Amino acid sequence: MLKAGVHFGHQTRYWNPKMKPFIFGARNKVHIINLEKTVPMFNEALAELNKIASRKGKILFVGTKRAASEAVKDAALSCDQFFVNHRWLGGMLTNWKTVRQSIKRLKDL
RNA sequence: CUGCAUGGCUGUCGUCAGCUCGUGUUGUGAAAUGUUGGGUUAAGUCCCGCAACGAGCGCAACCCUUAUCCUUUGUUGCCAG
């Protein structure tokens, strides 16, 4: 079975035409997805996440959005989970050459 | 003979707050960014914040000196005891 109950939103006024893979009709105050074929909307993405997670890969969780900032910090127990949730810096993944000296500052201070 | 040849030697914009670099980003590229912006300062000084994060020179700090008390040594100055 391809459900897997994961979505209950119905989007009552405004939509994006890029959502056409999931939305198969819209009549009267709804832009609702297909809820009986939900698994193919994420199965390949979670299979790739499972492949990375089982090949010692490091997983970064991002949630600066206040609703979930304290929720995204807990998901793993033995796998390499990392998170950012209160605040970012400019070039915090790209300028790691400079961030790796601020990681020292967190204990040197 | 000669400070548009050079040393030496002395001034001034100027103790002014000015001046840039790496990494990361951007633009075809020279080059920009940071250094703009907010509140400020003696001041690119300090805190706050974003595609920027950090570093250094000048600055800051540190130096010589002044008003005051405590303590001590004294003449052919001073005379308190």
PDB file of C-alpha atoms (C1' of nucleotides) in Angstrom:
ATOM      1  CA  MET A   1       0.000   0.000   0.000  1.00  0.00           C
ATOM      2  CA  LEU A   2       1.222   3.564  -0.928  1.00  0.00           C
ATOM      3  CA  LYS A   3      -0.220   5.196   2.314  1.00  0.00           C
ATOM      4  CA  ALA A   4       1.551   6.015   4.830  1.00  0.00           C
ATOM      5  CA  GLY A   5      -0.612   8.877   6.216  1.00  0.00           C
ATOM      6  CA  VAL A   6       1.825  11.888   6.136  1.00  0.00           C
ATOM      7  CA  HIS A   7      -0.195  14.943   4.923  1.00  0.00           C
ATOM      8  CA  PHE A   8      -3.568  16.591   5.907  1.00  0.00           C
ATOM      9  CA  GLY A   9      -3.201  20.191   4.500  1.00  0.00           C
ATOM     10  CA  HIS A  10      -5.694  21.348   1.788  1.00  0.00           C
ATOM     11  CA  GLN A  11      -4.329  24.866   0.767  1.00  0.00           C
ATOM     12  CA  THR A  12      -7.550  26.998   0.654  1.00  0.00           C
ATOM     13  CA  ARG A  13      -6.652  30.244  -1.338  1.00  0.00           C
ATOM     14  CA  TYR A  14      -3.187  30.340  -3.067  1.00  0.00           C
ATOM     15  CA  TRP A  15      -1.054  27.707  -4.930  1.00  0.00           C
ATOM     16  CA  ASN A  16       2.150  27.139  -6.954  1.00  0.00           C
ATOM     17  CA  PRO A  17       1.801  25.443 -10.468  1.00  0.00           C
ATOM     18  CA  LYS A  18       5.201  23.672  -9.709  1.00  0.00           C
ATOM     19  CA  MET A  19       3.122  21.403  -7.337  1.00  0.00           C
ATOM     20  CA  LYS A  20       1.347  19.735 -10.374  1.00  0.00           C
ATOM     21  CA  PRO A  21       3.184  16.341  -9.788  1.00  0.00           C
ATOM     22  CA  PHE A  22       1.236  15.991  -6.456  1.00  0.00           C
ATOM     23  CA  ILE A  23      -2.038  17.932  -7.241  1.00  0.00           C
ATOM     24  CA  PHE A  24      -4.352  16.171  -9.787  1.00  0.00           C
ATOM     25  CA  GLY A  25      -7.390  18.556  -9.650  1.00  0.00           C
ATOM     26  CA  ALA A  26      -8.698  21.638  -7.799  1.00  0.00           C
ATOM     27  CA  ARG A  27     -12.448  22.418  -7.392  1.00  0.00           C
ATOM     28  CA  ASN A  28     -13.952  24.599  -4.604  1.00  0.00           C
ATOM     29  CA  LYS A  29     -11.575  26.142  -1.944  1.00  0.00           C
ATOM     30  CA  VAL A  30      -8.836  23.380  -2.118  1.00  0.00           C
ATOM     31  CA  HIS A  31      -5.483  22.732  -3.830  1.00  0.00           C
ATOM     32  CA  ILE A  32      -5.075  19.289  -2.178  1.00  0.00           C
ATOM     33  CA  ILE A  33      -2.522  16.534  -3.098  1.00  0.00           C
ATOM     34  CA  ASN A  34      -3.031  12.815  -3.863  1.00  0.00           C
ATOM     35  CA  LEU A  35      -3.234  11.231  -0.352  1.00  0.00           C
ATOM     36  CA  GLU A  36      -3.584   7.535  -1.470  1.00  0.00           C
ATOM     37  CA  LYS A  37      -0.202   7.541  -3.424  1.00  0.00           C
ATOM     38  CA  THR A  38       2.109   9.389  -0.929  1.00  0.00           C
ATOM     39  CA  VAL A  39       5.077   6.903  -0.754  1.00  0.00           C
ATOM     40  CA  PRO A  40       6.410   7.656  -4.354  1.00  0.00           C
ATOM     41  CA  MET A  41       6.620  11.407  -3.350  1.00  0.00           C
ATOM     42  CA  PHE A  42       9.527  10.628  -0.896  1.00  0.00           C
ATOM     43  CA  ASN A  43      10.666   6.918  -1.237  1.00  0.00           C
ATOM     44  CA  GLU A  44      13.684   7.681  -3.540  1.00  0.00           C
ATOM     45  CA  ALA A  45      14.821  10.653  -1.380  1.00  0.00           C
ATOM     46  CA  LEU A  46      14.617   8.641   1.897  1.00  0.00           C
ATOM     47  CA  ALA A  47      16.359   5.681   0.156  1.00  0.00           C
ATOM     48  CA  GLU A  48      19.271   8.073  -0.721  1.00  0.00           C
ATOM     49  CA  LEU A  49      19.249   9.466   2.866  1.00  0.00           C
ATOM     50  CA  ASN A  50      19.343   5.802   4.149  1.00  0.00           C
ATOM     51  CA  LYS A  51      22.288   5.060   1.718  1.00  0.00           C
ATOM     52  CA  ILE A  52      24.274   8.108   3.022  1.00  0.00           C
ATOM     53  CA  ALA A  53      23.317   7.322   6.682  1.00  0.00           C
ATOM     54  CA  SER A  54      24.592   3.674   6.235  1.00  0.00           C
ATOM     55  CA  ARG A  55      27.914   4.786   4.542  1.00  0.00           C
ATOM     56  CA  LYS A  56      29.293   6.827   7.522  1.00  0.00           C
ATOM     57  CA  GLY A  57      27.903  10.081   5.968  1.00  0.00           C
ATOM     58  CA  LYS A  58      27.478  13.255   8.087  1.00  0.00           C
ATOM     59  CA  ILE A  59      23.887  14.674   8.188  1.00  0.00           C
ATOM     60  CA  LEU A  60      23.234  18.407   8.804  1.00  0.00           C
ATOM     61  CA  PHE A  61      19.771  19.431  10.159  1.00  0.00           C
ATOM     62  CA  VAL A  62      18.763  23.099   9.525  1.00  0.00           C
ATOM     63  CA  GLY A  63      15.851  24.781  11.385  1.00  0.00           C
ATOM     64  CA  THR A  64      16.288  28.565  11.972  1.00  0.00           C
ATOM     65  CA  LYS A  65      12.421  28.695  11.634  1.00  0.00           C
ATOM     66  CA  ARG A  66      11.280  29.140  15.312  1.00  0.00           C
ATOM     67  CA  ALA A  67       8.402  26.574  15.220  1.00  0.00           C
ATOM     68  CA  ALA A  68      10.873  23.625  14.899  1.00  0.00           C
ATOM     69  CA  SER A  69      14.307  25.069  16.054  1.00  0.00           C
ATOM     70  CA  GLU A  70      14.188  22.996  19.309  1.00  0.00           C
ATOM     71  CA  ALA A  71      12.692  19.889  17.554  1.00  0.00           C
ATOM     72  CA  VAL A  72      15.250  19.363  14.660  1.00  0.00           C
ATOM     73  CA  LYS A  73      18.148  18.926  17.197  1.00  0.00           C
ATOM     74  CA  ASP A  74      16.947  15.377  18.167  1.00  0.00           C
ATOM     75  CA  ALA A  75      16.575  12.642  15.479  1.00  0.00           C
ATOM     76  CA  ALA A  76      19.617  10.276  15.709  1.00  0.00           C
ATOM     77  CA  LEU A  77      21.104   8.267  18.636  1.00  0.00           C
ATOM     78  CA  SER A  78      24.339   6.708  17.118  1.00  0.00           C
ATOM     79  CA  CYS A  79      24.518   8.187  13.531  1.00  0.00           C
ATOM     80  CA  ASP A  80      26.463  11.451  12.763  1.00  0.00           C
ATOM     81  CA  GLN A  81      23.734  14.129  13.243  1.00  0.00           C
ATOM     82  CA  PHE A  82      24.707  17.846  13.372  1.00  0.00           C
ATOM     83  CA  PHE A  83      22.373  20.921  13.666  1.00  0.00           C
ATOM     84  CA  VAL A  84      21.923  24.743  13.226  1.00  0.00           C
ATOM     85  CA  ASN A  85      18.787  26.307  14.794  1.00  0.00           C
ATOM     86  CA  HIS A  86      19.305  29.661  16.700  1.00  0.00           C
ATOM     87  CA  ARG A  87      21.637  31.542  14.270  1.00  0.00           C
ATOM     88  CA  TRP A  88      23.877  31.305  11.103  1.00  0.00           C
ATOM     89  CA  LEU A  89      27.156  33.031  10.044  1.00  0.00           C
ATOM     90  CA  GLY A  90      28.195  34.276   6.547  1.00  0.00           C
ATOM     91  CA  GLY A  91      30.022  31.404   4.742  1.00  0.00           C
ATOM     92  CA  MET A  92      29.498  28.885   7.630  1.00  0.00           C
ATOM     93  CA  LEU A  93      30.001  25.780   5.344  1.00  0.00           C
ATOM     94  CA  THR A  94      31.928  27.382   2.402  1.00  0.00           C
ATOM     95  CA  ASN A  95      34.440  29.379   4.559  1.00  0.00           C
ATOM     96  CA  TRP A  96      35.204  26.398   6.931  1.00  0.00           C
ATOM     97  CA  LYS A  97      38.926  27.429   6.534  1.00  0.00           C
ATOM     98  CA  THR A  98      37.993  30.403   8.844  1.00  0.00           C
ATOM     99  CA  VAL A  99      35.181  28.717  10.950  1.00  0.00           C
ATOM    100  CA  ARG A 100      37.622  25.966  12.176  1.00  0.00           C
ATOM    101  CA  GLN A 101      39.465  28.672  14.225  1.00  0.00           C
ATOM    102  CA  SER A 102      36.124  29.804  15.835  1.00  0.00           C
ATOM    103  CA  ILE A 103      35.515  26.125  16.868  1.00  0.00           C
ATOM    104  CA  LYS A 104      38.760  26.556  18.943  1.00  0.00           C
ATOM    105  CA  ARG A 105      37.348  29.836  20.444  1.00  0.00           C
ATOM    106  CA  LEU A 106      34.335  27.851  21.893  1.00  0.00           C
ATOM    107  CA  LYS A 107      36.825  26.066  24.310  1.00  0.00           C
ATOM    108  CA  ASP A 108      39.754  28.564  24.443  1.00  0.00           C
ATOM    109  CA  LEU A 109      37.251  31.129  25.879  1.00  0.00           C
TER     110      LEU A 109
ATOM    111  C1'   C B   1      77.371  76.956 -10.795  1.00  0.00           C
ATOM    112  C1'   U B   2      73.278  73.156  -8.867  1.00  0.00           C
ATOM    113  C1'   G B   3      68.159  70.490  -3.889  1.00  0.00           C
ATOM    114  C1'   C B   4      63.646  67.236 -10.670  1.00  0.00           C
ATOM    115  C1'   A B   5      71.069  63.145  -8.637  1.00  0.00           C
ATOM    116  C1'   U B   6      71.960  61.317  -4.026  1.00  0.00           C
ATOM    117  C1'   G B   7      73.139  60.943   1.264  1.00  0.00           C
ATOM    118  C1'   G B   8      72.405  64.160   5.509  1.00  0.00           C
ATOM    119  C1'   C B   9      69.487  67.742   7.828  1.00  0.00           C
ATOM    120  C1'   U B  10      64.352  70.126   8.773  1.00  0.00           C
ATOM    121  C1'   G B  11      59.153  71.114   7.712  1.00  0.00           C
ATOM    122  C1'   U B  12      53.463  70.200   6.224  1.00  0.00           C
ATOM    123  C1'   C B  13      48.223  67.998   4.714  1.00  0.00           C
ATOM    124  C1'   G B  14      48.865  65.108   9.948  1.00  0.00           C
ATOM    125  C1'   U B  15      48.076  62.066  16.325  1.00  0.00           C
ATOM    126  C1'   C B  16      44.963  63.073  11.284  1.00  0.00           C
ATOM    127  C1'   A B  17      41.602  58.069  11.107  1.00  0.00           C
ATOM    128  C1'   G B  18      43.137  56.837   7.476  1.00  0.00           C
ATOM    129  C1'   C B  19      45.002  52.010   4.616  1.00  0.00           C
ATOM    130  C1'   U B  20      44.686  47.062   2.884  1.00  0.00           C
ATOM    131  C1'   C B  21      45.117  41.477   2.810  1.00  0.00           C
ATOM    132  C1'   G B  22      43.664  35.990   3.030  1.00  0.00           C
ATOM    133  C1'   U B  23      39.696  32.747   2.760  1.00  0.00           C
ATOM    134  C1'   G B  24      34.400  32.589   1.186  1.00  0.00           C
ATOM    135  C1'   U B  25      31.006  34.988  -2.194  1.00  0.00           C
ATOM    136  C1'   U B  26      29.835  38.081  -6.643  1.00  0.00           C
ATOM    137  C1'   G B  27      30.578  40.260 -12.075  1.00  0.00           C
ATOM    138  C1'   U B  28      32.357  38.164 -18.907  1.00  0.00           C
ATOM    139  C1'   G B  29      36.015  41.026 -16.583  1.00  0.00           C
ATOM    140  C1'   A B  30      39.059  45.404 -14.717  1.00  0.00           C
ATOM    141  C1'   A B  31      37.095  45.091 -10.102  1.00  0.00           C
ATOM    142  C1'   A B  32      33.458  45.069  -5.865  1.00  0.00           C
ATOM    143  C1'   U B  33      32.494  42.894  -0.889  1.00  0.00           C
ATOM    144  C1'   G B  34      34.281  43.191   4.086  1.00  0.00           C
ATOM    145  C1'   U B  35      35.521  49.014   5.207  1.00  0.00           C
ATOM    146  C1'   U B  36      28.369  49.918   3.498  1.00  0.00           C
ATOM    147  C1'   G B  37      24.291  49.922   7.432  1.00  0.00           C
ATOM    148  C1'   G B  38      22.458  51.143  13.247  1.00  0.00           C
ATOM    149  C1'   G B  39      23.802  53.580  17.949  1.00  0.00           C
ATOM    150  C1'   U B  40      28.315  56.077  19.165  1.00  0.00           C
ATOM    151  C1'   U B  41      33.750  58.019  19.980  1.00  0.00           C
ATOM    152  C1'   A B  42      39.208  61.334  21.079  1.00  0.00           C
ATOM    153  C1'   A B  43      39.235  57.613  16.863  1.00  0.00           C
ATOM    154  C1'   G B  44      38.029  52.125  10.868  1.00  0.00           C
ATOM    155  C1'   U B  45      36.938  53.624  18.931  1.00  0.00           C
ATOM    156  C1'   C B  46      33.341  50.193  20.692  1.00  0.00           C
ATOM    157  C1'   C B  47      28.847  47.251  20.507  1.00  0.00           C
ATOM    158  C1'   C B  48      24.819  45.505  17.249  1.00  0.00           C
ATOM    159  C1'   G B  49      23.690  43.163  12.430  1.00  0.00           C
ATOM    160  C1'   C B  50      23.656  41.266   6.969  1.00  0.00           C
ATOM    161  C1'   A B  51      27.288  37.363   2.168  1.00  0.00           C
ATOM    162  C1'   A B  52      30.745  37.868   4.681  1.00  0.00           C
ATOM    163  C1'   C B  53      34.309  35.646   8.382  1.00  0.00           C
ATOM    164  C1'   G B  54      38.916  36.684  10.232  1.00  0.00           C
ATOM    165  C1'   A B  55      44.035  39.271  10.362  1.00  0.00           C
ATOM    166  C1'   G B  56      47.582  43.335  10.399  1.00  0.00           C
ATOM    167  C1'   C B  57      49.866  48.656   9.981  1.00  0.00           C
ATOM    168  C1'   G B  58      48.342  53.694  12.164  1.00  0.00           C
ATOM    169  C1'   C B  59      45.126  54.072  16.798  1.00  0.00           C
ATOM    170  C1'   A B  60      44.067  51.946  21.763  1.00  0.00           C
ATOM    171  C1'   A B  61      47.067  50.137  25.953  1.00  0.00           C
ATOM    172  C1'   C B  62      51.944  50.922  27.680  1.00  0.00           C
ATOM    173  C1'   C B  63      55.853  55.679  28.547  1.00  0.00           C
ATOM    174  C1'   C B  64      57.981  60.906  30.816  1.00  0.00           C
ATOM    175  C1'   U B  65      55.405  64.456  34.015  1.00  0.00           C
ATOM    176  C1'   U B  66      51.517  67.288  37.563  1.00  0.00           C
ATOM    177  C1'   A B  67      47.495  68.405  42.152  1.00  0.00           C
ATOM    178  C1'   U B  68      47.366  65.122  47.527  1.00  0.00           C
ATOM    179  C1'   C B  69      48.367  62.191  51.839  1.00  0.00           C
ATOM    180  C1'   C B  70      51.556  58.699  54.579  1.00  0.00           C
ATOM    181  C1'   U B  71      56.907  57.588  55.695  1.00  0.00           C
ATOM    182  C1'   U B  72      62.082  59.008  56.047  1.00  0.00           C
ATOM    183  C1'   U B  73      67.150  62.094  55.594  1.00  0.00           C
ATOM    184  C1'   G B  74      68.839  67.231  56.495  1.00  0.00           C
ATOM    185  C1'   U B  75      73.217  72.036  55.430  1.00  0.00           C
ATOM    186  C1'   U B  76      75.523  78.652  57.017  1.00  0.00           C
ATOM    187  C1'   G B  77      67.837  77.605  54.210  1.00  0.00           C
ATOM    188  C1'   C B  78      63.577  76.482  58.301  1.00  0.00           C
ATOM    189  C1'   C B  79      62.666  77.087  64.529  1.00  0.00           C
ATOM    190  C1'   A B  80      57.795  73.544  65.410  1.00  0.00           C
ATOM    191  C1'   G B  81      59.135  70.145  69.766  1.00  0.00           C
TER     192        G B  81
END
